């Protein structure tokens, strides 16, 4: 058991690191490691469950193993379908992040900047604060009142929303305020 | 072996659920389960490592187990110290969330509302958008330009920042814009 005790000791050490540090804003290396572990967990779990089904104590455990195998396969398929839909609608690598389900796309500086959102909004605000664009609380970069993007989109796995600029305002010191309101929720995908 | 194969099958099923669904904006029941699992996983890992050290194959494995036990104890103590400092600063239950380290406190409706922040800032903006206060992208509640909070704080484990209202502006339709700028980073704790 001394060999197995050491192996089960290191089994839990990886479990401590993934639940405490492996987050997108905390540690990107451990976040990527968590993604690799998550992508490798499904086939191993499915194979282990079908192995427990074929080598079973009794027919009750066989049925339990079959049900658990179906459940893990359902989780695998659901994750892949949702991620592929979101990637087809936004073409960003945030689509494979299990934490996020809503993504904001902003065309700025000749590129599109994807950031996650917590809630789906009917109207989205923006501030400048001395020439530093800040949409929905996200620090995007340097921008002017006259250089504001004309149209942004918010993409999820089921629908794609379109937003347009309206109701700008200027204050002293190259600072301002703007609003983006939704006008279309159809026209899915790009 | 069939008994252990079923147990190692259910062992991985919990690992899949925690890494895919147990988040704050995601299933909160699973988030609480993840917190309980981590708090129980620390002492089990420490005890398993010290047991592998006391019953070891050779002196190499004893040293490895001792080093791993020291590492997991260090992680435990670091987590508890950081969480207790943050709770002393803000007195909120977001202090024990491993995903967050910066917290924003706003006095509104006779209470203090705590929300996490991605980055520490020198100036914080606010929008109204038809009488619905929205500070740093967080939906707080109903508020007016006249009823804006006069002072907010941003608390972390090491320091406590103080912010004050400045540079307001009103547009038509009970909407507006405000700015909060830091004036003091000392005077720790409440």
């Amino acid at each position, epitope marked *: 058991l001394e060999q197995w005790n050491l192996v089960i000791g290191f089994l839990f050490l990886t479990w401590i690191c993934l639940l405490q540090f492996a987050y997108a804003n905390r540690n990107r290396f451990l976040y990527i490691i968590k993604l690799i572990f998550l992508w490798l967990l499904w086939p191993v779990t499915l194979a282990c469950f079908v192995l427990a089904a074929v080598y079973r104590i009794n027919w009750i455990t066989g049925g339990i193993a079959i049900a658990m195998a179906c459940l893990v396969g359902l989780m695998w398929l659901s994750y892949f379908i949702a991620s592929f839909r979101l990637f087809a609608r936004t073409r960003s690598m945030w689509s494979f992040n299990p934490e996020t389900n809503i993504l904001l796309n902003v065309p700025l500086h000749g590129t599109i900047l994807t950031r996650p959102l917590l809630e789906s909004e009917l109207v989205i605000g923006a501030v400048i604060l001395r020439g530093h664009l800040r949409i929905a609380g996200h620090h995007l970069g340097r921008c002017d009142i006259k250089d504001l993007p004309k149209e942004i989109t918010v993409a999820t796995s089921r*629908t794609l929303s379109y937003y347009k600029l309206g*109701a*700008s305002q200027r204050v002293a010191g190259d600072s301002g305020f703007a609003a983006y309101s939704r006008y279309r929720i159809g026209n899915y995908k790009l | 072996l069939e008994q252990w194969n079923l147990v190692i099958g259910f062992l991985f099923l919990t690992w899949i659920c925690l890494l895919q669904f147990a988040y704050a904006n995601r299933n909160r029941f699973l988030y609480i389960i993840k917190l309980i699992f981590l708090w129980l996983l620390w002492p089990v890992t420490l005890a398993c490592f010290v047991l592998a050290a006391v019953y070891r194959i050779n002196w190499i494995t004893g040293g490895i187990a001792i080093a791993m036990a020291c590492l997991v104890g260090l992680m435990w103590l670091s987590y508890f110290i950081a969480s207790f400092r943050l709770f002393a600063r803000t007195r909120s239950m977001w202090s024990f969330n491993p995903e967050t380290n910066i917290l924003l406190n706003v006095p509104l409706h006779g209470t203090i509302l705590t929300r996490p922040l991605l980055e520490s800032e020198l100036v914080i903006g606010a929008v109204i958008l038809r009488g619905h206060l929205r500070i740093a992208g967080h939906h707080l509640g109903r508020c007016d330009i006249k009823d804006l909070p006069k002072e907010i704080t941003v608390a972390t484990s090491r320091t406590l920042s103080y912010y004050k209202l400045g540079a307001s502006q009103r547009v038509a339709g009970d909407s507006g814009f405000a700015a909060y700028s830091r004036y003091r980073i000392g005077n720790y704790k409440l």
Partner: antibody
Framework: EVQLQQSGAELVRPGSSVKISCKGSGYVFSNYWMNWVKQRPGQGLEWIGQIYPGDGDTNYNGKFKGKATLTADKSSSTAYMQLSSLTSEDSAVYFC?????????????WGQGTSVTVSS | DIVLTQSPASLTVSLGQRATISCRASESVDSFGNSFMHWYQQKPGQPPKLLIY???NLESGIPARFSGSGSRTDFTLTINPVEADDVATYYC?????????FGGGTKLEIKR
């Protein structure tokens, strides 16, 4: 203060066409939507279409498609609507409306209305 | 085209009592978490004036004696302390689908 001001009353003959205008002040005219409601002398209100003057994106009711054409002019801060092949059913009062934040689902401030008479 | 039906077509309330106006719908007006039902007031010779937007929210500058409720298909507007200045016609509008439709109209009379 945000405002909208329309043209005067129009008397036209059947078979002709008329062009109603509605211009606004106090805001950025290119970032808003206008909604162009119609009210018959004895009946209720009715919706015609929308336009975004910033780029020229329009929606239509479907009944008024072909009858009503919406255009805009950013430089003079003025929007136009043209009704063609006018008949006696086209006598009504035409409004223009917009939202406070520039949205297309809420009409917050209106124009005073323009009366069109189609008779010989 | 979501058809909105109002009831009654004419209402007479004493100076002080409450007035209740109903608006139906052919389909469900509730979008992805939003109601999109609006109420207007039009005095003769004037453009309509918005009172309630998204079926619950009160318009700024409107007295607090107007209140609206309802969801899905059934919607209701209430004027609890009616006054002599409330003589007008009230409409309901939907914005969920592309062709926006208005209600029939309910003329409010006052008894004395």
């Amino acid at each position: 203060e945000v405002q909208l001001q329309q043209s005067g009353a129009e008397l036209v003959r059947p078979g002709s066409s008329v062009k109603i205008s509605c211009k606004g002040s106090g805001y950025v005219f290119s970032n808003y939507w206008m909604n162009w409601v119609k009210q018959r002398p004895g009946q209720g209100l009715e919706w015609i279409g929308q336009i975004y003057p910033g780029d020229g994106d329009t929606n239509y009711n479907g009944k008024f498609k072909g009858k009503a054409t919406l255009t805009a002019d950013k430089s003079s801060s003025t929007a136009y609507m043209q009704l063609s092949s006018l008949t006696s059913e086209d006598s009504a009062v035409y409004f223009c409306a917009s939202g406070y934040l520039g949205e297309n689902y809420v009409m917050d401030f209106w124009g005073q209305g323009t009366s069109v008479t189609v008779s010989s | 085209d979501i058809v909105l039906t109002q009831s009654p077509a004419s209402l007479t309330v004493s100076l002080g009592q409450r007035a209740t106006i109903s608006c139906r719908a052919s389909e469900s007006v509730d979008s992805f978490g939003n109601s999109f039902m609006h109420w207007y007031q039009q005095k003769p010779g004037q453009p309509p004036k918005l009172l309630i937007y998204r079926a619950s929210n009160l318009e700024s500058g409107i007295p607090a004696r107007f209140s609206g409720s309802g969801s899905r298909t059934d919607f209701t507007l209430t004027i609890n302390p009616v006054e002599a200045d409330d003589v007008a016609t009230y409409y309901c509008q939907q914005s969920s689908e592309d062709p926006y439709t208005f209600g029939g109209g309910t003329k409010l009379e006052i008894k004395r």
